[PDB]
């Protein structure tokens, strides 16, 4: 509707998660400027709390990417001591910075997308992949929340979750640990789920009764 002035933004990362084999020299991921104007791409890595730490290095951390063009980032481990008995989680965030553009208030707002993906540090000691242990989640209800329990050494990145046929917004379950899902509205009072596999696709559906 051309009555109103419009602006468009967009950044695409070539994959939706990175599995980083512990101590690998480095891994590559593409970034694409899907827009009609050049941007600066600024990439950074955060710990699981979305906080600055630099056990991982992204290069180049700042560069210009022309309209419709793509480039690759190299993500490279820079030491750090990691646990061997479970995966560790960081976040790679790739931000696209746009170029400069008596009574009335003129509103001029600019936006930048900061597209963030999971960076899963996986000890070579761990045998298997998460799809092999997805069925092993168990479920309980405690203090009005739905609690997932993950006995595996992998993040269980839930991509679809339903509780008595009603949708719950997904979240990962950490390894050898739990996650507590808030129960709104008419969801209170069986759990079905799919994980996101290492290639970013939704895996098979599993279903279990709640316990306790």
């Amino acid at each position: 509707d051309i009555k109103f002035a419009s602006k468009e933004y967009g950044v695409t990362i070539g994959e939706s998660r990175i599995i980083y084999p512990l101590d690998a020299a480095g891994v590559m991921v593409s970034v694409k400027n899907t827009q009609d104007y050049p941007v600066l791409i600024q990439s950074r890595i955060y710990d699981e709390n979305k906080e600055k730490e630099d056990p991982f290095v992204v290069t180049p951390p700042l560069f210009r990417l022309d309209a419709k063009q793509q480039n690759s980032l190299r993500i490279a481990q820079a030491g750090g001591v990691f646990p061997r008995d479970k995966e560790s989680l960081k976040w790679l965030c790739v931000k696209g910075i746009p170029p400069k553009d008596d009574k009335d208030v003129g509103v001029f707002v600019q936006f930048a997308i900061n597209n963030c993906i999971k960076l899963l540090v996986r000890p070579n000691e761990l045998k298997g992949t998460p799809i092999q242990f997805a069925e092993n989640l168990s479920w309980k209800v405690d203090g009005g929340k739905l609690i997932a329990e993950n006995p595996s050494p992998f993040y269980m990145n839930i991509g679809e979750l339903t509780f008595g046929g009603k949708s719950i917004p997904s979240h990962y379950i950490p390894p050898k640990s739990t996650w507590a899902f808030d129960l709104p509205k008419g969801l209170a009072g069986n759990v079905s789920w799919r994980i996101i596999n290492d290639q970013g696709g939704l895996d098979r559906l599993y279903s279990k009764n709640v316990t306790l």
Binding site: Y9, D104, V109, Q110, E160, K185
Partner: protein
């Protein structure tokens, strides 16, 4: 599977200062369309931040060197037409966490009003980062 994120921004009606030097409340300042994301993307996974960092609000500042400011909120609707909202500076104004609509989701930037004092006519700006933490 790539992680594609897009945003369209569509400006709302022109804004004018009222007789009392404030702008009206609940004005449709502009409409946001978030898109590209994988179905299952959640509202708590989206965070609109700016330099002012006011939890739940985006802040616009005059460019005349006199520092007039107003705030706005960002809110939307789910499939049952219930009020929902992305995080703005780290916090949701309204509603339960929800799965975003398939394909794309609209949000509306609505006026709250001046931060303090009469607003002068002129150009007002904000620079807003839209962070999506993909599942």
């Amino acid at each position: 599977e790539p992680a594609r994120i897009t945003l369209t921004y569509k400006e709302g009606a022109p804004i004018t200062i009222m007789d009392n030097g404030n702008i009206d409340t609940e004005l449709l300042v502009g409409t946001l369309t978030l898109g590209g994301y994988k179905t299952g993307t959640t509202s708590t996974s989206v965070n609109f931040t700016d330099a002012a960092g006011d939890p739940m609000y985006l802040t616009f500042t005059s460019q005349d060197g006199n520092n007039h400011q107003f705030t706005t909120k960002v809110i939307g609707k789910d499939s049952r037409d219930f009020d929902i909202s992305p995080k703005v500076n780290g916090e949701n104004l309204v509603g339960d966490d929800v799965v975003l609509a398939t394909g794309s989701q609209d949000f509306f930037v609505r006026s709250i009003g001046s931060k303090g004092g009469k607003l002068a006519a002129g150009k007002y700006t904000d620079a807003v980062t839209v962070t999506v933490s993909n599942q």
